[model samples]
Target chain A: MTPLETVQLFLARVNALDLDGACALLAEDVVYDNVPMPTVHGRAAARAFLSQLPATAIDWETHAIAATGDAARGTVLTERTDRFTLADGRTLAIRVMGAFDVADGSITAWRDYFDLGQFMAQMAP
Target chain B: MTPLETVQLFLARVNALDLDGACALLAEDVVYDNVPMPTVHGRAAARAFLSQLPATAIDWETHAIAATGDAARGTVLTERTDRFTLADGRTLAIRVMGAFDVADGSITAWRDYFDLGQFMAQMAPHHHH
Candidate 1:
């Protein structure tokens, strides 16, 4: 799969809550860094970190995708808005910029940057 | 100048504290949106907004810059670290992502995104008791 396709598939799996499928797309030594949060290294750690999302969010829908980079080199920079619906029934739409590095059809590194303040504000009552 | 060159020159002008030169790089109808802050529209408003930076920041330095897009199409995306030294001698290095829209060799729209929490933390001690 192309780098963009790989990222899209990974996110699709995440939206579907298919932990196994999502984890399968990650490299063994994959590094996941969510800005303003601790970085998760390795597939096991990434799985552990991703597993907690379902408890807070029920769905994630992409509003737009702006991407740039060479798929042959396994690198892509994407900016998007992810609209999430909370398990508590609240909805929040946040913009996120992500940098992904892929190798051998698996994601090797993922960095997501966003405004923590905007997140908190949206989560507040 | 190319879009990248325009952006680079604008930053250089800003770093040198030459407000006029910096503002000159902006279009007359330019829109400046600093994420998590109010948007400033038009060159006059943009200039007015930028003029306040020198009072709070002694310097603006770019640690790294990653850019993409075509200058001929008049759009570009840049990610950078802006290291700012406050008036009280405190330094805050913030990561910023900027999107620029250029027309006729001048920036028509500029949007910079960054962590508001980080910025506030860095400015808190200096601004508040």
Candidate 2:
């Protein structure tokens, strides 16, 4: 699959709560960098971190997506609005810009940028 | 010029502090949407805001840039590290994700996404209570 397609598939799996399926698309040494916070190293750690989220539902609406480099190895960037519905019935919606590095049909690097203040305000009690 | 090339030129001119040249490449109806802040409408408003910056130096290092669609009309996405060097000699470095729309060799829209809290923390007085 192309880098774009790979990322799309991963997002689809993750939003569907099929995290196992999603993690399968990540490289063993994948890095998930959420700018303004500590980055998660390795796919296993990333999987653990995501699996620990309190979200009852997850949805990432991709507004625009583009990529550079070859079909096998390249960077795919996406502008998206991510919504996370929590167990407490509150939803956190964030506008995110994501950069994904795909290699050999696996995501090697996944970096997402967003306003932490937005999240803090929404997450605050 | 391609949408990619047009945006590159725009960034180049802005980094060079040639506000006039940068504004000249913008469409009259250009919208500069810096996400997390009030959007700036029209080329004139954008020009004014940028020109009013207190910074003594500006630099936006484009780490990665890509485009989709045609050369005349399309969108370009960029991952950039922008450094704003102020008159106080303090430089603010930020990571940004930018989206630019170009048509007829003019920039019609610009949107940049970044962490505002990061900026606020950096701007906070470290020595004060």
Candidate 3:
């Protein structure tokens, strides 16, 4: 699959609250760096991090994904809006720029950049 | 110049504190949105906004620019880091993702996204009132 396709699948799995399916798209030694936050390494940690999403009173909806990449390099650049329902039941939409490194149909590295202040402001009760 | 080249030149001019050079690359009706903050419109407004940067004892040093786009569409995506110096003489580096729309050899729109909390934290003491 193309890098964009891999990322699409990853997001789809996560949105579906299927942690296992999401982890399946990540390499065993994949690194997930959610900028301005802690980095989660390895499939186990990635799973642990993603598994907690559904437990919260939250949901993720993707509004759009603008992607650019070369099929051979396993790199994709994407800008997207991720709408979330906070734990307090308030909804927020945050724009994010992400860089993904895909290899052999699995994501090796995933980094998401967004405004931390915007996130906290919306998460605020 | 290509969209990437235009963005590169813009950043270069800003880094050099060459306001005129920077503004020259922007359209008369340019829109500059420093995301999560007020949006400044028009070249004049953009000038006013940028003119104050040097006074705050801030310095914009571009670490790197990773860009992607098509020259024909005049749209470009760039990820960069701007190292700054606060009024109190402290230093901070912030990561930014910028989208630029160019036309007729000028930037018509510029939007930057970064962590405002991180920025404020670095400027806190100077802003204490």
Candidate 4:
């Protein structure tokens, strides 16, 4: 598959909440890293990290900003409304930037950049 | 030019502090928006904003993780060290995510995502609630 096709497919799987299909688009030794957190390497580790998170149904609409050869990048405007139960019996909603990185007809890496101020605002009384 | 070439060239110009070269790659009616900030439209506003920023060189290297047509996205590992003087005789170092949004042969828009906690931490002692 072409680089653009790979990212398009990846976005589709995520929007559909197809975990198994999404996993197929990831590289074998994929490394997932985010700022202010530890890195998760390999498919199994990535799967484990994802499974622990609360179940979420994301509504993502993407616009392809650029692409070349076997690599592409785009921004996904996401409006997420999910319930995550906290230890103190409170459920929180998370909103974010679902940025993606595609390589070799698969998602070799992924990062979600979000606003901390928004998160803080959500918690305000 | 391919999308990869456009983004690669952008990174190069930003690193070299070539504002003129960087400005050449922006769309004539580009729209740039960020979280907690007002939107900037057209080439003139973008140029005005860029010109107001303090002059500094960036060191950037990119790895292609994805691309297609005239649009693509990738993660950039940036290590920036610069001094910005504040009004109260304080200097601060800014570190951030140099994320890019490229469409066509020019940069239609750009956004830099950084940690708010880090920013707050830098001014922690100075500002109290």
Candidate 5:
């Protein structure tokens, strides 16, 4: 699949909360760099980290700002807001900017930048 | 100027710490939204706020950028890392996602996203590298 196609598919799988399906699009050495947090360094580790999310699903109002411009490097840049909904009906929506590198039909690096405190304060005690 | 051209020049001015040159690319009523902090409204306010930065200069190793819209209305999105060097020779760096809205050869809106704590902790209690 093309880099843009791969990101779209991966995001759909993620928003669906289908970890298995999402992981399928990642390379074995995929690196998930959640800016402000430690990097999850591999597909197995990514699955482990994602499995800990306390949300029913995620929604992305995403724009593929660089699908065509950066395809030569298998790079796609995004600007979006992510809404994470808890099973109990609570939701935390925050703006996010992300970059993905797809090569050989698998995502090798995914980096997300956002205000970490905005996320932490959502369910703060 | 074209949106891409405007952004490219703006970045160069910023990298050079030429506040006046950079602000020249901003609209009179520009909105500088620094996520996790209060927004700086207007070019005058932006100049005031930016002038307070303790850093001598900033360098953005920008990558993965895309610009959309006509010269009348433009938006440029970017992913990059900002490296800041302080007056005391200390440094702090962080990844950032930026969105800039342009028109009339000026940026009307600018938003930046990054971890606030990551920036704050850089000089925490004189912690050494």
Candidate 6:
């Protein structure tokens, strides 16, 4: 698939919240890591994490994309619309970075960059 | 070469200020675009830009690096030493992000990220952060 096509599919699956479909696009032995969390290995772990994403409000925008022969790099600005439910019923917004890697038409890896403090704050009451 | 080896070599070459040597590791027709500058084409243009780097002082540290297949992603935190000579001989220090890409045994691209406000503040004579 062309680079643009690859990214388009990725964004579509992600926005659709099709965890299963998205997992299919990842390699069987894909590795996923986040800025403040332990590395998750294999497709199952990725799926397990994706399952927790609330269906309420999540949206993202791609600011730029660049591709070479088999590799592409891009920056995405994410905005979480729903107020993250806290223990005390308070809500907070979350922001994230979407960094990706695709190989042989499947994502071989994915890394996310974000401020841990901001994420944890939203989790707090 | 192994991924670690490739990164180590890159770090050494860059830290050594061997612009020519570093350029040798890049493709002939590489594309380099800074976060705020126009895209530069070819190794020659890259070298010309590097030539302006003041020889007085500069330093950097690699916080982390990761690689897979033919691609590698890494973050480098840079600290510039010495005073940058401005048009009026004013001194300024710069901080930068070292984001890079490698392909075909050479660096295919290099992108730098930084806050323009902070950069400009350092250039001002009366500014204090």
**Candidate with best lDDT:** 2
Full ranking by lDDT: 2, 5, 3, 1, 4, 6
Q: What C-alpha RMSD separates each model from the true structure?
A: 4.1, 2.0, 4.2, 6.9, 2.4, 12.0
Candidate 3: docking tier: acceptable
Report every candidate's CA lDDT. 0.72, 0.88, 0.73, 0.55, 0.84, 0.54
Better of 1 and 4 by TM-score: 1
DockQ ranking from best to worst? 2, 5, 3, 1, 4, 6
Best by TM-score: 2
Model 1 lDDT tens row, B11-110: 8887776778888999998889886788899888998986664445534554333344465435555556777676667788777666677665699888
- Select the stronger candidate by DockQ from 1 and 6: 1
TM-score-superior candidate, 3 or 6: 3
Shift in Å, residue B85, candidate 3 = 4.3
Give lDDT tens digits, candidate 4, residues B7-70.
6677678667786787788778877554435678877887788666455444444433234443
Fnat, one value per model: 0.20, 0.62, 0.34, 0.27, 0.73, 0.00
lDDT of 2 by residue, B1-129 (tens): 999899999999989988889999989988998888889999899999876557889999998788878968888889889999877777789898998889978999998999988877766555658
The 10-residue segment of model 2 chain B with minimum total lDDT is B119-128
Among these predictions, the greatest DockQ belongs to 2
**Tens digit of lDDT per residue, candidate 3, span B2-34?**
777898888877777678889989999899988
- On residues B3-66, what C-alpha lDDT tens digit does candidate 5 reach at each position? 8788888988989989889998999999999988999999999988988777787897787677
Error of 3 at B83 (Å): 1.5
Q: Against the native chain B, what TM-score does each candidate's chain B reach?
A: 0.81, 0.92, 0.81, 0.61, 0.91, 0.67
Q: Write the per-residue lDDT of candidate 2 for residues A20-122, one digit (tens) a residue.
A: 8999999999999999778999989998988766888999898788988897889998888999888888898898888999987999999898888787889
The complex in candidate 6 yields a DockQ of 0.05
- Candidate 6 chain A: 10-residue stretch with minimal lDDT: A74-83
RMSD of 3: 4.2
Label model 1 with its docking quality class.
acceptable
